[PDB]
Amino acid sequence: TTALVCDNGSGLVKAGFAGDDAPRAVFPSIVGRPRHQDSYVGDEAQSKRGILTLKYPIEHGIITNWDDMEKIWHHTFYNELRVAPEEHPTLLTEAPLNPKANREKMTQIMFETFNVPAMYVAIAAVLSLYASGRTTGIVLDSGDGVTHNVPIYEGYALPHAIMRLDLAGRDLTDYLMKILTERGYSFVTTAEREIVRDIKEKLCYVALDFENEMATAASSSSLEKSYELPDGQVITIGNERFRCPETLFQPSFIGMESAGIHETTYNSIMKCDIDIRKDLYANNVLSGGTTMYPGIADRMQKEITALAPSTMKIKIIAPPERKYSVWIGGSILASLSTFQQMWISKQEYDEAGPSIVHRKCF
Amino acid sequence: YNIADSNIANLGTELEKKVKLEASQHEDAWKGAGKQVGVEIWRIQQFKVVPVPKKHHGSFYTGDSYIVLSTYHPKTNPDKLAYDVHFWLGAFTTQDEAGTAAYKTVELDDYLGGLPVQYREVQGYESERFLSLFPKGGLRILDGGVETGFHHVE
Ligand SMILES: Nc1ncnc2c1ncn2[C@@H]1O[C@H](COP(=O)(O)OP(=O)(O)O)[C@@H](O)[C@H]1O
Ligand SMILES: [Ca+2]
Ligand SMILES: [Ca+2]
Ligand SMILES: [Mg+2]
């Protein structure tokens, strides 16, 4: 009996088998249908995006199209991993502070539609902390949909101090699409969104000092980079490289009044008991694709230093594999018989229904 | 948001502690642990918690991860037991070993009713408390270690 670990990100499915060191299937969490008004999933939808309109069933960590999400799960089991789900206990993931109904319906579909023998829904940031070999620390997890901060002490997340911002990679992609119009470029369609997402991933970075960097960008072309579009045209981008992820520190760039990711991290630590704050400040763990911008750890270090007491020892841990830290933590925990002992069995679901997820999954 | 409407509404509850206490009953390594003053040591070996024989206590493979339970009499009562639980991470331990050592440290803490105080001990960064566990010259680092439990995806 081999458990499946399926990290359903807002943007990417990461799926594979417990005990493996990496997910064996990683593909876009998208369903595509003809742009001219029957569907394609994942890599193939991306491949045919020239004729398709692409839709993400998960927005900001919440499943908003359950029919399409069923297609995503079906595709993961039968077309990618090529497994029979009724043979595999399955570990799923979720952002914290999601509405309770999201995991209730996840539980219903896994048992009633896919007939899994057992399942568990884990909080993503907790899995990343264990992947880093820690029981105490504060995780900053940022994917395509959610940025969340989870302080954890001696293996228990502190719910009163968990913070969440519905601002992450997809918002940054959309913002890059917008600001590229200032150069005369027009990226508007769902297919064009995927092109700009690639530009963002390849060329963006976090400036250590934003205003200084803006001045550098105007002084000469030293920061400019070229990028070849699928149709062969070559575009040039400059200060957009760092203005795009600056939004994480200045959410007003997209009209949000929220605190930036440095302030939210500080605020989360400050919600915890004073005697554990030094341990949290020394163990900030980054996880998720939106934490991959070059320069982000250094900028976090600088900004948290400015907010914290002047003698506070601060460390940002940025694992190189952090696009997969949640998945890897799930692979480790799902390899442990005691962790699997807490999973919901099909019989428990038959007798108790979806509500049982809240009594078993923490 | 509204925590009570959310998927973290039951974090921090007695129910959470009860479920995790039950899970810790399914690990053979904890049976009889922490029953008397002394040091008990296990090594992670392909995801399993494996006892280290007492003759080896204080010697640690640099490629491996370990759990060290130190049982002692607290100042408050010379006839009762208190606990420090240290997880020791070798400089060359692999991610599966360190992650299992962390998770299973929490589990042993659960098994002992939350009483243990946890200490993460990376090789070369060991706490003053950890250095005090072993007699003069008792702390020794050994080359090598046991193979990772991970299967490598090419
Ligand atoms: N090198 C990078 N720089 C900036 N953003 C990145 C990078 N790599 C991936 N991303 C972004 O991270 C997100 C996907 O990361 P992931 O952690 O898999 O998210 P999710 O779990 O929400 O699917 C997307 O927004 C993607 O564009
Ligand atoms: Ca080893
Ligand atoms: Ca404890
Ligand atoms: Mg994610």
Numbering used by the authors:
A (entry chain A): 5 to 41, 51 to 375
B (entry chain B): 7 to 160
Sentences from the paper on this structure:
Actin is one of the most abundant proteins in eukaryotic cells and plays essential roles in various cellular activities, including locomotion, division, and transcription control. The dynamic assembly of actin is controlled by the hydrolysis of ATP, bound to the center of the molecule. Upon polymerization, actin undergoes a conformational change from the monomeric G-form to the fibrous F-form, which is associated with the flipping of the side chain of His161 toward ATP. Here, we report the crystal structures of the three mutant actins bound to AMPPNP or ADP-Pi determined at a resolution of 1.35–1.55 Å, which are stabilized in the F-form conformation with the aid of the fragmin F1 domain.
The crystal structure of the F1/Q137A complex, obtained in the presence of ADP and phosphate, showed clear electron densities assignable to ADP and Pi in the active site of F-form actin. The polar interactions in the active site of Q137A_ADP-Pi were highly similar to those of cWT_ADP-Pi, and His161 was flipped (χ1 = 64° and χ2 = −89°). In the crystal structure of Q137A_AMPPNP, the two water molecules replacing the side-chain atoms of Gln137, WOε1, and WNε2, had a continuous electron density and were separated by only 2.5 Å (indicated by an arrow in Figure 7D). Notably, the two water molecules in Q137A_ADP-Pi were in discrete density with a separation of 2.8 Å, which is the theoretical optimum hydrogen-bond length formed between water molecules. Thus, in terms of the configuration of the water molecules in the active site, Q137A_ADP-Pi (post-hydrolysis structure) is less strained because of the geometric optimization elicited by Pi cleavage. We focus on changes in the local interactions and water network of the active site due to the loss of side chains (A108G, P109A) and discuss the various conformations of His161 observed in the F-form actins. It is noted that the Q137A mutation does not affect the rotameric state of His161.
